[PDB]
Design an enzyme around this catalytic site. Sequence first.
Site, PDB file in Angstrom:
ATOM      1  CB  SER A   1      -0.980  -0.058   1.179  1.00 27.18           C
ATOM      2  OG  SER A   1      -2.086   0.807   0.987  1.00 27.18           O
TER       3      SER A   1
ATOM      4  CG  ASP B   1      -7.402  -2.900  -2.964  1.00 26.40           C
ATOM      5  OD1 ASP B   1      -7.952  -2.024  -2.271  1.00 26.40           O
ATOM      6  OD2 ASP B   1      -6.209  -3.224  -2.812  1.00 26.40           O
TER       7      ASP B   1
ATOM      8  CG  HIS C   1      -5.857  -2.098   0.723  1.00 29.04           C
ATOM      9  ND1 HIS C   1      -5.487  -1.702  -0.542  1.00 29.04           N
ATOM     10  CD2 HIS C   1      -5.129  -1.348   1.585  1.00 29.04           C
ATOM     11  CE1 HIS C   1      -4.581  -0.746  -0.452  1.00 29.04           C
ATOM     12  NE2 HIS C   1      -4.349  -0.508   0.827  1.00 29.04           N
TER      13      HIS C   1
END
Length: 267
Positions: free
Chosen positions: A94, A216, A245
């Site tokens: 991320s 996601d 995610h």
Amino acid sequence: GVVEEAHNVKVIGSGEATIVLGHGFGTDQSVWKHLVPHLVDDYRVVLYDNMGAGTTNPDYFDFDRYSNLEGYSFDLIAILEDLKIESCIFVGHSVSAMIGVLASLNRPDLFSKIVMISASPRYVNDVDYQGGFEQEDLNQLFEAIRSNYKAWCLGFAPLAVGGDMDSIAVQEFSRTLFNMRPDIALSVGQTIFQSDMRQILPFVTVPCHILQSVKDLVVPVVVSEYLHANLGCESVVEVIPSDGHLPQLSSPDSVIPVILRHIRNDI
């Protein structure tokens, strides 16, 4: 050491071949628990927590330092230097994907490869770019965080993690989310969700592997295509038939083999 302690740095193994793993917003180095067992026999593995994670000392969170992602990229370089690491494979989950990218602009010599998990250079939509969120959507999110942080954590965690709403992964992420001090969570959330890394992508020289779940919450699949099209480095994309995610935590059976393939094999 000061840096080691502050970021809860863990080093597992000896020798040159080194993998460094950086986590995303709301979680910590534990997000890697299903990947690390398959790395330690072949690599020296380095884990660390981002400043502002609930596992870190809030007295160390400098709001000016972390007002842009560059502050986190300086932390990453500091950790590598402190450990006298001359070269690593960097796996960035991320926001850590973009933190690694930034670090690699300043010190490309320290990175042989970046493997991105659930990366995005821009979350906000414009008329020629799909990031997943209209600004009004983000405004609503920030207001929810400000109004009742626990309630926001409880609602956001199942959406972000995906899968069954009462899975252990959802429970874990709810816990690490709420472990953040609420003012830090709000500030970091704003900094990350309003970030824009698109303009520096053409300057990247370190090869990148771009991995994400096909479903996601905060990363539309077209974002992986965008990264691939605009990164100035050699890159490859693999969208995984997974939900979530934090798919390395919540869906390891389908996700870990893909991540390992991209770590172990070069473009």
